[PDB]
Design a protein around this ligand. Structure first.
Ligand SMILES: Nc1ncnc2c1ncn2[C@@H]1O[C@H](COP(=O)(O)OP(=O)(O)O)[C@@H](O)[C@H]1O
Ligand SMILES: Nc1ncnc2c1ncn2[C@@H]1O[C@H](COP(=O)(O)OP(=O)(O)O)[C@@H](O)[C@H]1O
Ligand SMILES: [Mg+2]
Lengths: 460, 41, 577, 315, 193, 159, 193
């Protein structure tokens, strides 16, 4: 090995290195202080004169004299294997469980090679969640990405925890489904409170999620460039598993807004002009870089489903982060401070919540017969039930007829029994029969979007 | 309805004005730093 | 040719040394891998390569060579049944070669080069050729194909090859000016294939759905626009006007979108049926496709690739419908490639030259005559998808300024089960007058009067429906109830096409004019009935309305045996009462 | 003849010429690529070290070796004749009719000079238009400028092609002199859809106003310099035919918003600070150039009356 | 320079009804008239030039139409001030700067106008000055500061525009000159936002 | 100007309800003006000669027709004398710092001549520290019966 | 360096009704309180400092007005400890840096307050740190980064700002210390937009 000493211009998070024309662009270096300590850094802006090393941590022990830099792993990769399904990491990929660090089966580049679209069929078999208001009204299918437009003060992380520890594919509605396929949950969390990291490790290790869920948890006080590199690590592990062993991989990306602010900080650090509202102009393609690595494949059997969760800043949707995510992904689900301060867990009001891929995904053979009719009927019924509920403050309850009194009792019982769940583990059949029990409160003949035979076959 | 659309559109355009000023100034200061890299010799 | 080296790499901007005398905007293979850059901003010796792909793992002092040609496309036979990226690299042969990902720094050619096509010569040695003249035919899928001399080339032809079973790398002819001429040729993508004159629209682009030529014509050689929301079925409309068009060559361009909203294009479009000869539609349709994670300038120049390929098909005397997808995504691509250039922004965030680039896009579309001198037309059915949904954004603003036929699609009408989802109270055409003499000469001498009448009715219905909305649609008066029932049956019968029906998939001008005259005759027959002595509701239950409700589902090859029969039938049916 | 070479730095629509000292600020050059195609360019920011040629067209395939730059016509002159009544021109003004090019009669500069305001009389006589609210409540006095505001989806093109043809001055409502003052309409199309160009050709040929009018149609797929240069061509031919033949020319500037996007598109070259919403702040001086060029002069019977039609970008 | 500045106690009789009934201007005072297009502004400036109690009207119009200047020069040598007789034109010095004239001359023009106003206030004359469309003078400052590559602030207007504008308006007032005469110069500044 | 004039002429600490006997010393006015025009100047000095305060007051006048950079020195120069007369002679100094908007425009001019990155609406970042070092040279100290009470007059731009 | 961190089962018993009942702070947790000028930040913080259940209160004035600080220094030793009977200043280490006091000292003050609170949480106490005006520390970062000729982030702060703020709010959290015992830092941070 060689060590590039003789370095000038240490400034902020950057430092220059004279006559290092061997560092390729995007090379990982380790900065050995004269005092025996080693930092990590990434090489940008190589020249014939000097290369630039951005430093992960704060530059504090450095000096112009006693500084050396050493190349390690000239493009950033990771060692990947299957045995790592209970192993916490932090961005880099150091184990933090106090357990033996693994040996590689492969050595994959952390950046994504994009998918040839001809090798992607359409995603058309579902995956339940446990959350009945997800799995009834606006379903999730294997391969789709759909975000959670969480509020800035709502419990997003409990929802991420519960859906990570509860969601399992069910093949017994399909064509003689076997359970030889495992189900890998890859869970990345970036820019997080210490308290909620302890909450996540408690929640994962309490119900046996830890046996089958790999974790990339890095904190806020970690360097921002590790928050850039973390979902690259999570998605290349997801791609390795699902496309090299034909698994079913659900990936959950906590707090994409932290990824956004780390991207903006590193853009302004590496000295380039920001664009819309002080954001980098390449945020769209860099955000597609870690969304569009999911899907299903013609020929293979894998399934990469991607739930990112993003905190909107103060609940607008023309902010650039939810604009790009609602402009890239397939639909959204949306939390609400209204229904949460009213007091319901999970706080999903569904009336702005929408999938754009349920139409291809559900149906007989796939999951169930009546599913789309139930979804549309409940959507329109709760839609006019909300407006009747806000109208009745003026009109007076006696001054409305029998039918809209039934609608208002429908909304009142609906938000108590269908949505309000807490930790109540529900599957899809209980979801449908509670949907029909709620729809029984409307009189028959009012159910105009459900054909007659389903009424005769399910009413109660 | 239209008065509130006019007010919201006016606030949008004055924020766009502020953003054009600041990207102009950052273009200027990047010009300064490139000029200073030239100035050192 | 010009082999220089790299002296700086900053992100995707590779500053290269040694290329003094190198041109502007060329290919510039980079490194031992070889990445296709582009050359901007020369300075003394140096040249600023912008690299399309990620520059992870390149060093200083690595060789960089150029080609000299600008960003070109290749043209010839075999382009049909083609799927490409934004820089025309056929993704079927790429998944065939190198796995299911896309390895950076790979190169294939657009054409196949290893299929012996069947040459047929048509000029003789002793002739001379000017640019744009055909000199040899190739049959591809039973679609006739015509090899042109590339434009701005002339010369006297010698060494003409006989009827040979050849490949694309055999020059069929040579000039006496040096200058061999092969089947393929390259062309710079940022300008039009020059053509001797354009025309003015006197031909209606036969879409085939029975609203969007009748009330909202688009006039072949024209230009449309559709904003497409989820919950309206844009894709089935694109398949319908790709399946039942007047145009014989469709260029579909997916200029970057959701990947799963493009895999349905990949797995549904080659299982359509070309409903003219019998096979699938892919034997006459070129397909460009992009995800949102491909290299950026590929996604930018994607639609220029599409337009230039469509011009290559228009110079063979054809009828090209270019349908472009989601132009706002292309605006996002242009915005991102602007922010790499550190450009001063515009109204929303765009470049200042957005209107100029959309002008250069749309105005390369019209009914035109070739340099060989025959007619062909390259009209555009290009879409728009509003990100914000607000129609004040500059992309929809400049699109609505430039295009000549603006349609709308609603989330409300498909929610009310109205297929297609066209709004007729917010959409507008401009091709009425230029299609007026064609309509008089080739439809009838009252078809413009009759579309004036139905446009009056569809203005009038929503003009009057407020007291219907408030009071109640039972207690109106006895002309306006007839206007409501006529407008309702206008909606439910003249507007509503089930595109998956076997015989209702298509509507030529005589069927539309026939149903159109039938419903106006019903109006001014029932109005005579209600103005003489009777009320409305006893007219509303009648086998006339059954015959109008079946009149769209009768085949056109029973239509002379349906039209005047039902006409006199309605006539006597109210003459008796 | 007199070909500078030595191009140091080509960036965008700008390039830097070494050793240039004989050039002049605001002069015109042609750039000659080695392949054999010229391009127009303008000479700005002339220094002893180098001179900044703004390129007019897109740059493509230029080099630093064979880029032959040559000075062409120091003042931005134009060969103007009388008998240009009724021929389509380019945005530059080159003919597109198949007809031969015109013999010049005065090669005067296209920028024009400010009128001396102690030489202008008041606009004091009338012209008849077709449109009744323009004739009675509004009134088009001969010798002024007035715009037509319009909207995004509103018919202003037909009002343009209507006032170009059903508007002639009535001389016998005043005293007499009716032969010696004929009428002419200069019609500059700043930025057009091709459909509009077809409509204007068919309507002008139909009504026969082409025997009085002069056509400066843009064909707006051309490079933006032709769009920005056609109003000065139009008003230069208008001022020649109105102050050297005593006519009463009505001028129609077609859209002015394609004009202003052309100005904000060339304005993002020098990195000058943009004004309100991206329009560069010298736009008021440029519109004062292409508006207050009109007016009436004492001693002459000339009048140049301006109708700039402009749509709002939004209402 | 003057001996001493007085206090304004006598109204500049502006002549129009609202402008002295409701919101009057004193003889040494300054007034600002905003107003967008289509709100007159030139009818009002020419009316103040015609009908006042000035002694000399210095009409300095910068960044402006030509028809206004030739209107003022056509229709003044027949109308008559209320005090004297003869043409009105023999008490009005006007400094035209039409908006097609070159952009740097405006900052010369405004100070030429106020200098002539002080030379006439030194001769016992209650000078009225009409500085028309000083927003174009602000555009002239913006154009030269953007030519000279300094920092812009608040939409390109260079940050010493308040110092320039304050030192302009502060030249007005009611003084007593060194000869012993009194005098006052008033400024009507038409701003076009 | 008239509110500041009325608090200048007829404001008085009331010793009797405070319960300390009396010393009943009237005030001392440090009137520092930064670009008041001429009329406000006339009004303030005639108000002060009509209330008879010019035998116990000081004026640092920096008028509109004065040059535009000495506005940075004017308030600090006034408050130096204010600190002096308070903390060496046991006074009750009231300081009228007129029209701080002209101070802030002069600060904006000297910040933009030196290219410095401004905060909101083109004002530089150190405006906080400079308005701090104008304002917080005021208050009362322990033991010394001198005191400084400031009225700075702002002019809100868009009110 | 601390041995282990935990999850908090103990509230910060504030003393005010809303800021204990409807919006609680757990003893390891942190809290932010933004508010415009003239709204009641400082009186809220002094209410906390007078009536919390803290063994030791570190009070950090980072860029404020001086009378706030001297009011605290006069007003606390005349009062009563809620826990013991002592004077209330005996549980408060006060770190002050008022606005006139020099500019780059603010980063020093805001790190020194949290490190003295970290010393006292290493003694098994339970510490309340009321630090106000970290916006002024961001503004001091704007100050010194403006003279390095650097490229600022959104609106003018140097772009490692949120990294510094996350590193600052890291240090709390109901921790089991090195000597076996447990302790806590809670942080009440005022942010002034
Ligand atoms: N609980 C309270 N009771 C009475 N007055 C209060 C109370 N809280 C705040 N105030 C008043 O609110 C004002 C705001 O003080 P301050 O904390 O400086 O506001 P901010 O810091 O929010 O600008 C103080 O003058 C104080 O008198
Ligand atoms: N042309 C100039 N002359 C003097 N000072 C300037 C100029 N331009 C900017 N400044 C200001 O003066 C400071 C000079 O910074 P610099 O010379 O890099 O380091 P130092 O702070 O040691 O002087 C910058 O912060 C800048 O805001
Ligand atoms: Mg406060």
């Amino acid at each position: 090995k060689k060590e590039y000493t003789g370095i000038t211009y240490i400034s902020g998070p950057l430092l220059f290195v004279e006559n290092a024309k061997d560092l390729a662009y995007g090379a990982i270096v380790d900065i050995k202080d004269g005092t025996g300590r080693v930092r990590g850094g990434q090489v940008i802006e190589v020249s014939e004169e000097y290369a630039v090393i951005q430093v992960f941590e704060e530059t504090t022990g450095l000096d112009l004299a006693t500084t050396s830099v050493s190349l390690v792993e000239d493009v950033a990769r990771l060692g990947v294997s299957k045995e790592m399904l209970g192993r916490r990491f932090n961005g880099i990929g150091k184990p933090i469980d106090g357990l033996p660090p693994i040996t590689p089966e492969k050595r994959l580049p952390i950046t994504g090679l994009p998918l040839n679209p001809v090798a992607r069929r359409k995603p058309e078999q579902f995956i339940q969640t446990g959350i009945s208001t997800i799995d009834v009204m606006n379903t999730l299918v294997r391969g789709q990405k759909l975000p959670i437009f969480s509020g800035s003060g709502l419990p997003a992380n409990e929802i991420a925890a519960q859906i990570a520890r509860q969601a399992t594919v069910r093949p017994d509605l399909s064509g003689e489904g076997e359970k030889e396929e495992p189900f890998a949950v890859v869970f990345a969390a970036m820019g997080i409170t210490q308290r909620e990291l302890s909450y996540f490790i408690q929640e994962f290790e309490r119900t046996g999620a830890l046996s089958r869920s790999v974790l990339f948890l890095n904190k806020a006080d970690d360097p921002t460039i590790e928050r850039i590199l973390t979902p690259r690590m999570a998605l290349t592990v997801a791609e390795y598993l699902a496309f090299e062993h034909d698994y079913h991989v659900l990936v959950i990306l906590t707090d994409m807004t932290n990824y956004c602010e780390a991207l903006r900080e590193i853009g302004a650090a590496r000295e380039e002009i920001p664009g819309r509202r002080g954001y980098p102009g390449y945020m769209y393609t860099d955000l597609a870089t870690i969304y569009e690595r999911a899907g299903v494949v013609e020929g293979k059997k894998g399934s990469v489903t991607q739930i990112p969760i993003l905190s909107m800043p103060d609940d607008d949707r023309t902010h650039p982060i939810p604009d790009l995510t609602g402009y890239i992904t397939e639909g959204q689900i949306q939390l609400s401070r209204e229904l949460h301060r009213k007091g319901i867990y999970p706080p999903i009001d569904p009336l702005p919540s929408l999938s754009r891929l349920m139409n291809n995904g559900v149906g007989k053979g796939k999951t169930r017969e009546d599913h789309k009719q139930v979804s549309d009927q409940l959507y329109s019924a709760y839609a006019n039930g909300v407006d009747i509920r806000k109208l009745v403050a003026i009109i007076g309850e006696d001054a409305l007829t029998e039918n809209d009194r039934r609608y208002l009792q429908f909304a009142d019982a609906f938000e108590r029994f269908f949505i309000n769940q807490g930790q109540q583990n529900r599957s899809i059949e209980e979801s449908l029969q509670i949907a029909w029990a709620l729809l029984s409160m409307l009189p028959q003949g009012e159910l105009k979007r459900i054909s007659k035979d389903h009424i005769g076959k399910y009413y109660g | 309805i239209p008065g509130i659309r006019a007010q919201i559109r006016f606030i949008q355009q004055v924020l766009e004005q502020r953003e054009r000023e600041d990207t102009f100034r950052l273009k200027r200061i990047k010009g300064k730093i490139e000029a200073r890299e030239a100035e050192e010799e | 040719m010009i082999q220089g080296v790299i002296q700086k790499i900053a992100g995707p901007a590779v500053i290269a040394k040694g290329m003094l005398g190198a041109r502007m905007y060329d290919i510039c293979k980079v490194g031992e891998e070889g990445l296709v850059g582009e050359i901007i901003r020369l300075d003394g010796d140096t040249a600023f390569v912008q690299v399309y792909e990620d520059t992870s793992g390149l060093k200083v002092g690595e060789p960089v060579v150029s080609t000299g040609l600008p960003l070109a496309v290749e043209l010839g036979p075999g382009m049909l049944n083609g799927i490409y990226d934004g820089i025309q690299r056929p993704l079927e042969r790429i998944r065939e070669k190198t796995g299911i990902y896309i390895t950076r720094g790979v190169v294939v050619h657009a054409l196949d080069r290893e299929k012996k096509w069947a040459w047929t010569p048509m000029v003789k040695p002793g002739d001379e050729v000017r640019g744009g003249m055909v000199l040899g035919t190739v049959p591809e899928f039973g679609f006739t194909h015509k090899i042109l001399v590339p434009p701005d080339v002339r010369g006297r032809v010698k060494e003409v090859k006989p009827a040979g079973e050849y490949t694309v790398e055999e020059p069929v002819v040579v000039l006496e000016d040096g200058t061999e001429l092969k089947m393929y040729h390259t062309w710079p993508v940022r300008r039009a294939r020059p053509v001797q004159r354009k025309l003015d629209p006197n031909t209606p682009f036969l879409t085939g759905m029975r609203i969007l030529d009748v009330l909202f014509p688009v006039a072949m050689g024209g230009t449309a626009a559709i904003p497409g929301p989820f919950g309206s079925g844009k894709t089935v409309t694109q398949q319908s006007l790709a399946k039942w068009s007047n145009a014989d060559v469709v260029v579909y361009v997916g200029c970057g979108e959701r990947g799963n909203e493009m895999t349905d294009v990949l797995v549904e479009f080659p299982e359509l049926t070309d409903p003219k000869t019998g096979g699938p539609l892919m034997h006459r349709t070129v397909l460009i496709a992009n995800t949102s994670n491909m290299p950026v300038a590929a996604r930018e120049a994607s639609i220029y690739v599409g337009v230039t390929i469509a011009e290559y098909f228009r110079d063979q005397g054809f009828s090209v419908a270019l349908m472009a997808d989601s132009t706002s995504r292309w605006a996002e691509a242009l915005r991102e490639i602007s922010s790499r250039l550190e450009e001063m922004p515009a109204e929303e965030g765009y470049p200042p030259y957005l209107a100029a680039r959309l002008a250069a896009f749309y105005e390369r579309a019209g009914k035109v005559i070739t340099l060989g001198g025959e007619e062909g037309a390259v009209t555009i059915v290009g879409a728009v998808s509003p990100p914000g949904g607000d129609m004040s954004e500059p992309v929809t603003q400049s699109t609505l300024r430039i295009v000549g036929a603006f349609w709308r699609l609603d989330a409300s009408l498909a929610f009310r089960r109205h297929f297609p989802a066209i709004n007729w109270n917010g959409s507008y055409s401009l091709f009425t007058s230029a299609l007026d003499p064609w309509y008089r000469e080739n439809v009838a001498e009252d078809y413009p009067e009759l579309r004036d009448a139905i446009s009056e009715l569809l203005q009038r219905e929503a003009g009057l429906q407020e007291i219907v909305q408030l009071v109640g649609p039972d207690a109106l008066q006895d002309a306006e109830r007839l206007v409501i029932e006529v407008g309702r049956i206008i909606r439910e019968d003249f507007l509503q096409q089930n595109a998956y029906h076997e015989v209702d998939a298509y509507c030529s001008m005589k069927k539309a004019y026939g149903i159109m005259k039938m419903i106006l005759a019903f109006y001014k027959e029932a109005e005579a009935a209600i103005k003489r002595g009777v009320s409305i509701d006893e007219i509303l239950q009648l086998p006339v309305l059954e015959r109008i409700g079946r009149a769209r589902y009768v085949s056109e090859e029973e239509f002379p045996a349906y039209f005047e029969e039902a006409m006199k039938e309605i006539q006597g049916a109210f003459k008796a009462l």
